[PDB]
Paper text:
The respiratory syncytial virus (RSV) fusion (F) protein is a major target of antiviral antibodies following natural infection or vaccination and is responsible for mediating fusion between the viral envelope and the host membrane.
Our reconstructions of the F:131–2a complex recovered a clearly identifiable postF head domain, while the stalk remained largely unresolved. The final map at 3.1 Å resolution reported here is based on C3 reconstructions with symmetry relaxation of the 3:1 and 3:2 complexes, followed by symmetry expansion and combining all poses with a bound Fab into a final local refinement with the constant domains of the Fabs masked out. Interactions are mediated by all six CDRs of both the heavy- and light-chain variable domains. The most extensive contacts are made within residues 379–399 of the F1 subunit, a looped region exposed on the surface of the postF apex, facing the internal cavity of the trimer’s head domain and stabilized by an internal disulfide bridge (C383–C393). The loop is stabilized in the interaction with 131–2a by a hydrogen bond between F1–N325 and residue N66 in the framework region 3 of the light chain (directly flanking CDRL2). While the conformation of the 131–2a epitope remains the same in preF versus postF, access to the epitope is blocked in preF by the α10 helix and heptad repeat B (HRB) of the F1 C-terminus, which refolds into the helical stalk region of postF.
Numbering used by the authors:
A (entry chain H): 1 to 9, 11 to 30, 35 to 59, 62 to 72, 74 to 128
B (entry chain E): 217 to 468
C (entry chain D), D (entry chain F): 217 to 324, 331 to 468
E (entry chain L): 1 to 31, 34 to 57, 65 to 72, 74 to 80, 83 to 109, 114 to 127
F (entry chain C), G (entry chain A), H (entry chain B): 27 to 65, 79 to 97
Write the structure that this text describes.
Amino acid sequence: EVQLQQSGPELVKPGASVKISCKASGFTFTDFSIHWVKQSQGKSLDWVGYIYPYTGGNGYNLKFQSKATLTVDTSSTTAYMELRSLTSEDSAVYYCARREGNFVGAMDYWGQGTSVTVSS
Amino acid sequence: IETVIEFQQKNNRLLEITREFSVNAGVTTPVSTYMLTNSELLSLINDMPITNDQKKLMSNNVQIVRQQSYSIMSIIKEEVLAYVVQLPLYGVIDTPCWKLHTSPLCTTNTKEGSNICLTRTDRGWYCDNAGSVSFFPQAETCKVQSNRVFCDTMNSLTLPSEVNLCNIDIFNPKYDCKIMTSKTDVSSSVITSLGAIVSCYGKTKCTASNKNRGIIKTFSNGCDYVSNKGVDTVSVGNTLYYVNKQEGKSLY
Amino acid sequence: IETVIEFQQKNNRLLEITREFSVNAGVTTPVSTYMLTNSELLSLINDMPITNDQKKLMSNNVQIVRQQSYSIMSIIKEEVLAYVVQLPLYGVIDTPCWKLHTSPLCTTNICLTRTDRGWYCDNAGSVSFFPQAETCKVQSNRVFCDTMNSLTLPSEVNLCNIDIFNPKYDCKIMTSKTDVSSSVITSLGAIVSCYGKTKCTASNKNRGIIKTFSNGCDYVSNKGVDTVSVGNTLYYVNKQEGKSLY
Amino acid sequence: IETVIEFQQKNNRLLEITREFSVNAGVTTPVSTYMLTNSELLSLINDMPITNDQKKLMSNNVQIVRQQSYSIMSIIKEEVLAYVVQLPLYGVIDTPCWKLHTSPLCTTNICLTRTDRGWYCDNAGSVSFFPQAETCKVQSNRVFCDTMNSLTLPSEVNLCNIDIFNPKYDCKIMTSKTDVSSSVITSLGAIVSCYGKTKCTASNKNRGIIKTFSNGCDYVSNKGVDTVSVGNTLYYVNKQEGKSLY
Amino acid sequence: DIVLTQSPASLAVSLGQRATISCRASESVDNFGISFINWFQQKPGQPPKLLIYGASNQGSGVPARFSGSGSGTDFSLNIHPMEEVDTAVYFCHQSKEVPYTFGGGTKLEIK
Amino acid sequence: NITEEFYQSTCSAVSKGYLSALRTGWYTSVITIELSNIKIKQELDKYKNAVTELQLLM
Amino acid sequence: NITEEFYQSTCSAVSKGYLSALRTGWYTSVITIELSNIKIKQELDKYKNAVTELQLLM
Amino acid sequence: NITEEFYQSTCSAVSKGYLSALRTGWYTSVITIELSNIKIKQELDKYKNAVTELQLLM
């Protein structure tokens, strides 16, 4: 079925731009939109941004515009999240969502969740 | 008796343009081969302030160029007839175009019975102009010759390059796609350039049908594409949409 | 000299199509009687996959059938002129249709105008809406449209005639904030909206001014009224019969 | 031999009406000079129930009156041919008009293109708006529209020229979220919208580049500016003149 | 920014009963008549999974005990009957326009 | 005569200075053009074929 | 046959009594019109020039 | 050349694979054909009547 693998938990020093990889297998990658959702340590599902892989079209919540750079590789059906200038407030879990739109069935199945731990 | 037909035969080009200006009452479109020959059109194509591939392009498409050019009569006397031929000048050339056909799409589900059945009203031609899409909603301003699309920017709208997300989402947060809505299920087929979209919802029975093999497919409650090389007709309820051009007998 | 006239007469069928293919630059609509004669067209309806009654209808409406059929030149040579004649192929037939006309409706203060005037036809249990003016042709009680640009709306569009905002369909509207008065010439009469200080009179050519509209939207038949004056502009409800020439 | 040519020559009028009715399949427009001569049209202007100003107006613009008048065949026989010519009857005359041209206006991110471009004409204290480009024909300073499919907007449409968010009359707009560059060739000039990284230069035919647009929307008069380069597109503000032929 | 208020915070429901969760939007999330509210369920150590989409419909492979209701600026998720396996945090996510907003989420532990 | 104002507050150019004629109704007229006949037969049969096609057209 | 109902509630007029024929596809016919050529030279040269100008459009 | 994709998410088919030629301006050309005059009277009267009727159009 439709499944979304995610990269393993990373333990990174602060200030390093890291890359989260989300591999999508089981559907048409030019018909949906891989949304990115950051859950912090015991709080709500804070939205980060969207990428429509049909054109690579990216947009952000306006507190992650200077933080995240979300890209596609449509030939390998993979989504990527570039995290820049990492601080202790970004030690969290990140999810990629398949997110069928257009009178939605939104966010059918999700990635397994990349745990980024930023500390010295 | 011989001189009147000699007047007809020498002035073929002159009597036809006066007739073609009478019928259209001064302003004539499309321009004819009597108003402008192929040699004169080619020599004028070599004259325009355009690059070389544009001149080659209008040399390869001397029919569509005639179908986009007016010719307004200016001064007519007893022995002189004059008209401005408004040949087209293409600003941009060799950038990708695409024609968007849409169809009703009902969000069918039996869990509740809540269907809203969108339709997109922005069908028509799109082209790349200057890093932004030039969109033509009229079906008469754009003419196609087998790989080439010729439009005009007189009343053309100008939309950003992020309208391609309109093809996979309506509520994408990069452009507000033109959409009308319904509240009950509708079923119609939209024939396209190289196929046909078939939307079949509710109690409507839509069956595809090859020319030779009869019924080959029965559409469920959903929107399905089908090519013009796989089927030949589509029956939606009682409307028999013809996906291909039905060949008929010839005449002599 | 006689052979030239014989060439003009015998090859008239070819010279005329050459002329309308030069003038129209390879694609010609409507199909002329020189392009497809009545015997050849009527033998070309006895061959289509349509029903027998559709063969019966397209024989009695050949004027509109020719006004919807194209003729695209394909192979031109010195001895052979070939052109694909794209005749219409009607999917549905003998189903109710109705035209819609709209005029401003002002209330004591916003005026509304349903800006979806056009043709509606029962297509497959839903309604095919045609907003253009050239797509739909009209014979005596027949409406011949085409579905190349037809929108598809449900059968609940009829609720947009007794209520401006019915909860079962979203009627296309155009709002205004000041009073506006006008008149719309319909098929069998005229809608006259007279609001504000505008003076509107309906008058018949044989009796002078017969009625004066108050502030409201009224209907006028075309069998007892010939002109309607709104403000200073004079709409003609019926077509003015003029002279006869020779 | 002689009688065939005299049949063509004494009867050019009926022959060309027959040919033009065959090509157009019974309904032709515009009305030709074979279907209605200038003397017959001029004797027909004086007979319609209109004011003396309208008859003076319609005799100077017979090219546009012919371009809005139809000619529907009524009865055809081997001896006579009759056809109803539907001439225009103008309700209002000598009232102001103005054409609206629009271009994307971007502020920086949003862009607002007023999609309601078209023709406007004062009808009866409220402005008839004609969005289609085929309804209205323009002579030297004169506009000839028809109010068949025309939207009767109030007189407060002038306030949309200076304000998008005017409270007296809302303006219908198309909204983009990204900088967009274009150029609109208007009647007596051209609008040039140059936003983002697009490089737009206004160039004179005999001078080269004479203006470089900054990030904004500007207007060039067609007296000085001939071409405009927006990115790679060359919008010709004027009409380029070519070699004459014989 | 259409902020959504989700109530309550911690919900105690007896085994085999009805549990309701309210989500009040600050703006109208309806678009052409139908709402854009999706209810998700996230067990600990697991990704959130779709339950309700369109504020009324049911997701693929979701039992009928979950039901969406409401319109305008008020929506409700109803779970009835109640089992021991449905202990998680639920989220009401708005889908009208950017930025999309998730509710605070209710943690339902069985009373 | 014709002027064209330009408003960059909306990026719109208005071409003012025009006078109207709004068509509201139709003025019909029946023109019955006759035929001069000649008592050669190919032209007459051509015209009668055109007449027959025009008659069957309606 | 034709009726027309007026609605003062929306200020509209619906023209009823019509029956449909909706075009959905195209039925093509490759009609080959031959030439009855004759064995005066200016007429044939005119027709040949018209044929050549028609050929060069494609 | 032309590839037509189909997107079932919005039920739309897109015909990609075309190359543009977007008209932006005009290119006027004054073409002046002179009458091949002739010194028969009815044909000349017909042509002069056509010329007069086209002159009164302006």
